[PDB]
Design a protein around this ligand. Structure first.
Ligand SMILES: [Mg+2]
Ligand SMILES: [Mg+2]
Ligand SMILES: [Zn+2]
Lengths: 86, 110, 295, 77, 193, 168, 52, 119, 54
């Protein structure tokens, strides 16, 4: 668990790194901030003019636990329990 | 217009012609699995009235609900044979076909 | 003949909107509420501008100026006076029609008095009864103590004049007496302390200007706009005052001198503005600063 | 409550209910009131029935209802 | 003990004594509950003080007698309100007992009503689409002819004396079961002097 | 991870994104498509992606699909009146197929908006009852009214226990 | 959908209906009244006081 | 449950708790329990005065006119609520009880006067 | 005359629709054929006592 935790956190991709790789702006959308587009990272080099291909159906692998929780089908007496501040 | 039969229009596949003036038709519907959220075919057997006994085992038929059930289990009648078994006529072009190849070329009649 | 323009007229709407200004930062300020993990999108320069345009469009809807209404006439109407029921009941009965497909200003709310007289419910009673059967978020059946003089002055001391207007709008109807008093008291505190910038880029800015023009007290607002380099809005303030007061010294002075642009303020400052000397000094200070930047 | 098959109580075998004494003046005035009140309510009831019948007919074969039916059929073709 | 800051609760948080003890972090930061198992009970103790006696592990509010829960003590209440969401932490989060958490909830609500505590106030849409007041429900309906003349809305509302023959008919119909005949009622409701 | 390729198809979020709501006339929809051929590429994607969306929004419409029976893919709709609607889908993307059937046999946005408003009238805010059906249970929840005796005890004058004692 | 029929329920229903016609009470029995006690001997119910 | 005969009736269903009466105006079958199944609730009635000294009555007039036109009867207390609202003419019992109350208080005045005058 | 609340709503409906008239709405109670309570009823529709003797 300890070695796994440091492995993933070391390999996370920052927004600035993603913007540089894709050559595009990374825009943050916050529900609290409404529809206001917020630029968190911009590529230092040339900026691409062609938009990313908007795939109608993304081919990504979904964890069943996340989907089941989202649909409310996951009941658990041990979830969302009130606990001390961390 | 009014009919007591719940299933007004249904399309199924004939699985038996062993009864007089009645074709046993199997109807499949897509039913959602509550947990897997994937649709699987659910098959129910319907008896259809066939006056001319022109149905053949293995074809696709259209069933119209009778105003009243003429028998205990016969509630529908043969409306139109959508796809005859082995003698399918392509609705788009009107030419006979055998699978994905036209038996008669659509360019024969321009 | 000649009719004075109303608050909802397009000429007034266009001028007030330009005096409000769309600030996407303030119009969509990060609110302190329950938060969710934000989503991220990879957008080009063209898409980012389009997203900015949609935020501008959504800002206009949020910045729609509420209509301004006069105080509603109190309802004193009697449907019938049945003297037979006099003294039989010690408590009056309030009847509210709760039919769903009826506007809340067209519902028959009647009160059966202990004297036996059947009368229509007053405005204060009608608003209270509507919330009972058709609750609205943010509106309390009992008037909150926030609207007392001491509590409101506390809000003013904290520069939260927008919060007061938000609370008043949710609780009281626009034509209610309490709605008018709270808005008018809020406007007076703004003018006294020169807090006009708080209501900028808000849907309530237009009402503040409308209150000031109708009382010929745009002297404070004109000073603030000039000091913030808003001459285009400052000129529109003088022009709007002239439109709503054709028979005035400033309005007649403008016609005689054919003043336009900055000259309009000078005519208004000398003729009708109470603090004309301060306005002239303020306008002179801006004009000197602008000249240096021109060179 | 008691059913039809439950035996009658013994204490109420000899029970007799005496009708209340009648005030001649109040009885006649009140009797007229019940003949006027029920006349007005029945007239009100007839109007309420007609409104319900009219609303059903208007939704079934009203001018506005039939106009939508022909409009949808025209669009479908 | 008698805290001298009871009159002005906000004075305690500005003293040098407060800075030495808590510092720049909330009062409940160093408090940790004592319970069995890894999952704490979903409800804290009902009260840390019983009959003027303090339990062995007092809650952060109860452990300091100089901390007074009052709506004027705005700085203290902010420590129990999430600065990013504006909601009030539940009892297991901070560790305060149920009695003091209820006192905190009332104090926080009281502070918001008076405007002493800053909270998010959403912007709502107007209730009525149309503001016209010309409808008869809110306007003055023309009076009925009966109302103008002062007559009852119906003729049978008032008392009308029955004919003598009709009264005799009722007496004959109800012989031996007759009450004293009643005249017209008083025009107005009497009152006790 | 969820089993199968494109696991998003088996989520309620994806199935509720269907914009095609068939009219009351449509009863049976039959899909004939070819498993192979570049021209029938849209038909296969329509079955793979859009068919679950259509059936979810139209639970009472029978959907039966036939594979490799005709040289070209097509859609057939059987209306209640007896009219049979034929749609050609050859060399058309699944998005184009989705929009075509919606245009000819799907209810417009105006009709769908009207239907939702009818359900709003069913739940009347002024009604009192269980939380399942009504917003409030008792008039005591309305502020300004006499509160529930469980929370705030009533005065002895308003309680029947002391009404009889005072009288007798 | 087959359910065990209740022949006796139908048999008892017809028997009760038939007996209520064959053994129906007559007006002389139903409406006889004992003028001394003002009660009907058929049912033993007292007549209303106002009818005495 | 299909009762034998019966009809719809607009009546008051008692809610609330002990010593806290609260009536919901509902349109239910005649044979149904007082607080049992109902077809449609048509309003509410709070007999206890609130902080403003008012008794709140809600009358879904559009639905009330609908059910009355469908043959629904009215309970006697409901016929008095409509009379108080002016939707219906005042029930004769309300007028009659008003006259009786006036007579009752008129006799009390005479008794009070005699006590003061004689003694 | 209409009851006070009903008359007000009917008159309010006229003003909302734009109709302007001072006529007072009234109920056609002429159709209502009030009958004496002692008027004979339908003996055909009246039942009969049961056959249980005492
Ligand atoms: Mg009658
Ligand atoms: Mg009739
Ligand atoms: Zn504690």
């Amino acid at each position: 668990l300890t070695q796994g935790l440091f492995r993933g956190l070391s390999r996370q991709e920052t927004h600035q790194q993603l913007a540089d790789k894709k050559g595009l702006h990374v825009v943050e959308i916050r529900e609290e901030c409404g529809p206001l587009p917020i630029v968190v990272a911009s590529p230092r080099g040339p900026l691409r003019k062609d938009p990313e291909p908007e795939d109608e159906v993304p081919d990504v692998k979904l964890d069943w636990e996340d989907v089941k929780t989202a649909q409310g089908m996951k009941r658990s007496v041990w979830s969302n329990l009130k606990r001390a501040a961390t | 217009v009014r009919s007591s039969v719940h299933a007004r229009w249904i399309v199924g596949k004939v699985i038996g012609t062993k009864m007089q003036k009645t074709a046993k038709v199997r109807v499949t519907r897509l039913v959602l699995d509550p947990y897997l959220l994937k649709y699987f075919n659910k098959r129910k057997t319907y008896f259809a009235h066939d006056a001319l006994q022109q149905c053949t085992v293995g074809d696709i038929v259209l069933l119209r609900a009778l105003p009243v059930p003429r028998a205990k289990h016969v509630k529908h009648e043969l409306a139109e044979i959508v796809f005859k078994v082995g003698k399918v006529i392509d609705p788009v072009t009107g030419k006979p076909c055998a699978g994905t190849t036209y038996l008669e070329s659509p360019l024969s009649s321009e | 003949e000649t009719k004075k323009p109303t608050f909802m007229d397009e000429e007034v709407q266009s001028i007030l909107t330009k005096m409000t200004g769309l600030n996407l930062q303030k119009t969509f300020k990060p609110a302190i509420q329950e938060l969710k993990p934000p989503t991220y999108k990879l957008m080009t320069q063209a898409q980012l501008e389009e997203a900015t345009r949609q935020a501008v469009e959504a800002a206009k809807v949020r910045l729609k100026m509420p209509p301004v209404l006069e105080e509603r006439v109190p309802i004193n109407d009697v449907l019938a006076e049945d003297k037979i029921l006099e003294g039989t009941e010690t408590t009056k009965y309030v009847f509210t029609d709760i039919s769903y497909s009826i506007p809340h200003r067209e519902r028959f709310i009647v009160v059966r008095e202990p004297s036996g007289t059947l009368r229509k419910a007053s405005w204060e009673e009608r608003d209270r009864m509507i919330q009972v059967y058709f609750p609205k978020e943010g509106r309390k059946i009992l008037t909150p103590i926030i609207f007392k003089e001491e509590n409101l002055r506390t809000m003013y001391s904290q520069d939260r004049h927008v919060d007061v207007l938000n609370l008043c709008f949710a609780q009281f109807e626009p034509d209610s007496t309490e709605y008018i008093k709270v808005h008018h008291k809020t406007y007076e505190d703004i003018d006294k302390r020169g807090k006009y910038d708080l209501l900028r880029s808000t849907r309530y800015f237009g009402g503040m200007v409308w209150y000031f023009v109708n009382n010929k007290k745009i002297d404070g607002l004109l000073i603030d706009q000039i000091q913030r380099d808003l001459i285009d809005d400052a000129t529109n303030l003088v022009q709007l005052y002239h439109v709503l007061h054709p028979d005035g010294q400033s309005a007649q002075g403008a016609k005689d001198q054919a003043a336009e642009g900055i000259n309009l303020i000078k005519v208004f400052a000398k003729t009708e503005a109470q603090k004309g000397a301060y306005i002239e000094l303020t306008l002179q200070t801006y004009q000197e600063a602008l000249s240096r930047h021109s060179a | 409550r008691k059913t039809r098959h439950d035996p009658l109580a013994k204490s109420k075998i000899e029970r007799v209910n005496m009708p209340p004494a009648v005030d001649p003046a109040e009885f006649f005035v009140l009797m007229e009131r019940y003949q006027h009140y029920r006349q007005t309510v029945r007239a009100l009831r007839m109007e309420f029935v007609s409104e319900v019948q009219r609303k059903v007919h208007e939704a079934r074969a009203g001018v506005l209802a039939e106009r939508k039916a022909l409009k949808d059929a025209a669009e479908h073709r | 003990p008698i805290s001298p800051y009871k009159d002005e609760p906000w004075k305690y948080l500005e003293s040098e004594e407060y800075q030495e003890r808590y510092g720049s972090r909330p009062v409940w930061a160093d408090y940790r509950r004592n319970h069995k198992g890894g999952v704490p009970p979903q409800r804290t103790r009902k009260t840390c003080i019983r009959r003027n006696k303090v339990v062995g592990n007092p809650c952060p509010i109860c452990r300091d007698h100089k901390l007074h829960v009052d709506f004027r003590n705005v700085k203290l209440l902010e420590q129990f309100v999430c600065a990013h969401t504006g909601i009030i932490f539940y009892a297991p989060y901070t560790g305060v007992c149920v009695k003091q958490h209820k006192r905190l909830t009332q104090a926080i609500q009281k502070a918001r009503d008076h405007g002493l505590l800053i909270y998010h106030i959403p912007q709502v849409e107007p209730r009525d689409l149309d503001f016209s007041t010309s409808h008869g429900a809110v306007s003055a309906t023309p009076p009925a002819p009966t109302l103008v003349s002062g007559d009852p809305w119906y003729p049978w509302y008032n008392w009308k004396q029955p004919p003598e023959r009709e009264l005799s008919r009722l007496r004959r119909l109800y012989q031996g079961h007759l009450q004293e005949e009643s005249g017209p009622p008083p025009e107005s409701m009497p009152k006790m002097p | 991870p969820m089993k199968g390729r494109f696991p998003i198809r088996r989520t309620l979020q994806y199935l509720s994104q269907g914009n095609v709501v068939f009219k009351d006339s449509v009863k049976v929809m039959t899909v004939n498509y070819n498993t192979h051929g570049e021209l029938g590429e849209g038909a296969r994607k329509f079955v793979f992606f859009n068919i679950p969306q259509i059936q979810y929004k139209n639970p009472w419409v029978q959907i039966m699909m036939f594979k490799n029976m005709t040289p070209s893919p097509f859609l057939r709709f059987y209306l209640d009146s007896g009219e049979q609607v034929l749609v050609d889908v050859e060399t058309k993307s699944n998005k184009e197929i989705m929009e075509h059937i919606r245009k000819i046999l799907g209810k417009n946005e105006e009709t769908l908006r009207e239907e939702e408003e009818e359900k709003k009238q069913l739940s009347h805010p002024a009604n009192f009852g269980p939380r399942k059906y009504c917003l409030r249970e008792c008039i005591c929840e309305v502020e300004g009214q006499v509160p529930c005796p469980s929370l705030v005890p009533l005065p002895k004058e308003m309680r029947g226990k002391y009404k009889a004692a005072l009288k007798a | 959908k087959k359910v065990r029929p209740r022949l006796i329920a139908e048999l008892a229903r017809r028997v009760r209906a038939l007996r209520e016609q064959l053994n129906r009470p007559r007006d002389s029995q139903l409406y006889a009244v004992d003028y001394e006690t003002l009660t009907r001997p058929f049912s033993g119910r007292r007549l209303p006081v106002r009818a005495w | 449950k299909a009762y034998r005969g019966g009809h719809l009736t607009i009546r008051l269903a008692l809610g609330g708790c002990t010593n806290r009466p609260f009536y919901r105006i509902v349109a239910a079958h005649n044979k149904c329990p007082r607080d049992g199944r109902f077809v449609e609730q048509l309003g509410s009635y709070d007999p206890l005065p609130n902080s403003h000294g008012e008794k709140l009555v809600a009358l879904n007039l559009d639905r009330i006119r609908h059910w009355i036109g469908c043959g629904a009867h009215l309970s006697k207390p409901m016929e008095k609520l409509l009379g108080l609202a002016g939707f219906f003419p005042l029930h004769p019992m309300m007028i009659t009880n008003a006259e009786r109350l006036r007579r009752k208080r008129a006799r009390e005045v005479l008794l009070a006067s005699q006590k003061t005058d004689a003694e | 005359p209409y009851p006070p609340l009903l008359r007000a709503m009917i008159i309010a409906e006229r003003q909302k629709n734009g109709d302007t008239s001072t006529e007072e709405p009234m109920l056609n109670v002429q159709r209502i054929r009030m009958e004496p309570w002692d008027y004979p009823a339908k003996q055909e529709d009246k039942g009969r006592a049961k056959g249980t003797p005492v």
